[PDB]
C-alpha cells in the first residue's frame, strides 16, 4: 500500500514490540518512537527513536547501538506481527526533538 | 569541491597601507578587472571617511566593518527531507567577506552622484551603526532568529 499508511502502522507495531518484548538492559528510558519514514518501496524503513536519559551521547549512543544490534530480532517480531510482504530493513536514528 | 575541500588563496598585502583585508575589499568592489579605478575610489573614500572620523583610515574602516560583520545567518538545508531554513553561526572570514560585500552593494545602490563619495558616506554611516548595510545585517539576524525552533 501507500508508504505513509504502512509507516503509521509500522510505527504502532514497533512502539508496541519495543515497550513490551525487549530484554536488553541497554534499552529502557521509556524509549518512545516519534515516527518512521520508509521508501516508496516498502523494502527499507528508518525509525526515529527518542530517548529520555539526559541526552548525553554516552547513553543515547548505547541505545541506538543496541537497537541496531537487535534490528534482526525486531524485524522477526515485526514480520510475524504486522502482516506485510517483505519485512523491511530497519535503520534507527536519534530524533533530536530538542532544537 | 566534492573530493578535496580546497583552501583559499593568499592576497598580498595592500600597496599603500598594508592591510590584506583592504586588499580583499578593493578586489571585492573591482569591476571588470579594473583594479586601479577601484583602488583610487577606495583610497579617496577612506581619506574622506578619516577627516570626519579624526581616526586612522585602517581603524575607522575596521570599526565600520566589525559594525557590519554578522554572526548568524539563514541557510537552506536538507537533512530530514525538509526545506530547512536553519539559522547557523558564521565563520570569521565568511563574516568579513559578507560585511565587505554588503557595504559595497549598499554603496553601489546609494548613488550620491559619485562612487568614492557614496562609499565614504555609507562607511561613516555604518561606523555610527546606521545605514542600509547595517539595516541588512539586522534583517539577516532577524530572519535567522525568528525561527529558533531548529536549535
Amino acid at each position: 500500500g501507500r508508504p505513509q499508511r504502512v509507516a503509521q502502522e509500522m510505527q504502532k507495531e514497533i512502539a508496541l514490540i519495543l515497550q513490551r518484548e525487549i530484554k536488553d538492559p541497554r534499552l529502557g528510558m521509556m524509549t518512545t518512537v516519534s515516527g518512521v519514514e520508509m521508501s516508496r518501496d516498502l523494502a527499507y524503513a528508518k525509525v526515529y527513536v527518542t530517548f529520555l536519559n539526559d541526552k548525553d551521547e554516552d547513553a543515547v549512543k548505547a541505545g541506538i547501538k543496541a537497537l541496531q544490534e537487535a534490528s534482526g530480532f525486531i524485524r522477526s517480531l515485526l514480520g510475524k506481527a504486522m502482516r506485510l510482504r517483505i519485512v523491511p530493513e530497519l535503520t534507527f536514528f536519534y530524533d533530536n526533538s530538542l532544537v | 569541491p566534492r573530493r578535496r575541500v580546497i583552501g583559499q588563496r593568499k592576497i598580498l598585502p595592500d600597496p599603500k597601507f598594508g592591510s590584506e583585508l583592504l586588499a580583499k575589499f578593493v578586489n571585492i568592489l573591482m569591476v571588470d578587472g579594473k583594479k586601479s579605478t577601484a583602488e583610487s575610489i577606495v583610497y579617496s573614500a577612506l581619506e574622506t571617511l578619516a577627516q570626519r572620523s579624526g581616526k586612522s583610515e585602517l581603524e575607522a574602516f575596521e570599526v565600520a566593518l566589525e559594525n557590519v560583520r554578522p554572526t548568524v545567518e539563514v541557510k537552506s538545508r536538507r537533512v530530514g527531507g525538509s526545506t530547512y531554513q536553519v539559522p547557523v553561526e558564521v565563520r570569521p572570514v565568511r563574516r568579513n567577506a559578507l560585511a565587505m560585500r554588503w557595504i559595497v552593494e549598499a554603496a553601489r545602490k546609494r548613488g550620491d552622484k559619485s562612487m568614492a563619495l557614496r562609499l565614504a558616506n555609507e562607511l561613516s554611516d555604518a561606523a555610527e551603526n546606521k545605514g542600509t548595510a547595517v539595516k541588512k545585517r539586522e534583517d539577516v539576524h532577524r530572519m535567522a532568529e525568528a525561527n529558533k525552533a531548529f536549535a
Binding site: 499508511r5 512502539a15 508496541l16 515497550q19 513490551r20 521509556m30 504486522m82 526533538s97 | -
Partner: protein, 117 residues
Amino acid sequence: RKQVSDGVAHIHASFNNTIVTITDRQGNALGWATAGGSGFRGSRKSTPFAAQVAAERCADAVKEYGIKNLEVMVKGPGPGRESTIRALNAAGFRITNITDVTPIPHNGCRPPKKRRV
C-alpha cells in the same frame, strides 16, 4: 480550591490522543486537558508538541489547587509521553517517580484483526 500539595498525573498516551489528568492520591480527579481539546486535530492531534501543550493547559487548571509534588502513571505507548513528561517537569512540578502502568493481560481477550495496509 483546597490544598493537597501531593497529587498524581495519569497520562493516557493513545496513538491518536493524549489525556493528562491530575488527581488526588485517592483517585479523586481535579482537572484534565487533552491533546485534542488544545486546538489540534488529525495528525497534530497526536503529536508530541500538542501533548506538551495539553500538559501545560491542564497544569494551568489545577495550580489553584496548590500542588508541586507528583507521581505520574503513563498508559499506552503512544507518541506523547516524553513530551508531556518534560512539559510538566518544566512547569515547576517536582516529579518523584514515573511509572509504566499500561494494562497488559495474561492472554485475556482476543485482539482485533490486523489491518491489511
